[PDB]
Amino acid sequence: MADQLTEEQIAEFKEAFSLFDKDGDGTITTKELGTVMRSLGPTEAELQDMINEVNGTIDFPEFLTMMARKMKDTDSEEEIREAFRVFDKDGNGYISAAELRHVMTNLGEKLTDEEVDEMIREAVNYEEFVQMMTA
């Protein structure tokens, strides 16, 4: 989906897409697409994938849906890191099993006690626990 990004990121991408080429129809070529991607924030495989997903013209929604992937990935990684860095006053990166089980049972969403016990048995480090839960 396109709702994983932030409004400021969309505004910056729109400003770059408008200022990169002439006014009005701001369509760009493949080389222009790569240049705009390098200016906004570079591998040849990503450029080839963006060209294949898009003759040789790239409009606004194509560039948006090509850029959204890595942006949302980095945003999710940063959010997970910031969430794992909080709460724990020690900050060492590990927590007790009892505290983790209590946080998973009495907080989060709607998880039964049996499901929480199964998740605890299937699994400490917060990042490793999140990676094991995501699978």
Author numbering: 1 to 41, 44 to 56, 61 to 129, 137 to 148
List sentences from the manuscript.
Ryanodine receptors (RyR) are >2-MDa membrane proteins that allow for the release of Ca2+ from the ER and SR, thus mediating a range of Ca2+-dependent processes. Each forms homotetrameric assemblies of ~5000 residue long subunits. Mutations in RyR1, the skeletal muscle isoform, can cause malignant hyperthermia (MH), central core disease (CCD), and other myopathies. Here, a collection of cryoEM structures provides insights into the molecular consequences of MHrelated RyR mutation R615C, and how apoCaM opens RyR1.
Similarly, two classes and corresponding structures were obtained for R615C pRyR1 in the presence of apoCaM, with 69% open, and 19% closed channels. Of note, despite identical conditions used for WT and R615C pRyR1 in the presence of apoCaM, there is still a larger proportion of open channels for R615C pRyR1, further highlighting the inherent effect of this mutation to facilitate channel opening. The N-lobe can interact with the Bsol region in two different modes, with the open state complex involving a bending of the Bsol region, induced by movement of interface 2, just like in the WT pRyR1:apoCaM complexes. Comparing the open structures in complex with apoCaM, the differences between WT and R615C pRyR1 are much smaller. Relative to the Nsol, the movements in the Bsol are dampened to 1 Å around residue 2443. Similarly, the relative positions of the inner helices within the pore are almost identical, and there is little additional movement in the N-terminal region. Despite this, the position of the inner helix S6 and the width of the pore are very similar for R615C pRyR1 and open R615C pRyR1:apoCaM. Thus, upon binding, apoCaM pushes the R615C pRyR1 into the same two conformations observed for WT pRyR1, with one corresponding to an open, and the other to a closed channel. As the ‘intermediate’ conformation for the R615C pRyR1 without apoCaM corresponds to an open channel, the addition of apoCaM thus results in a redistribution of such open channels to a mixture of both open and closed channels.
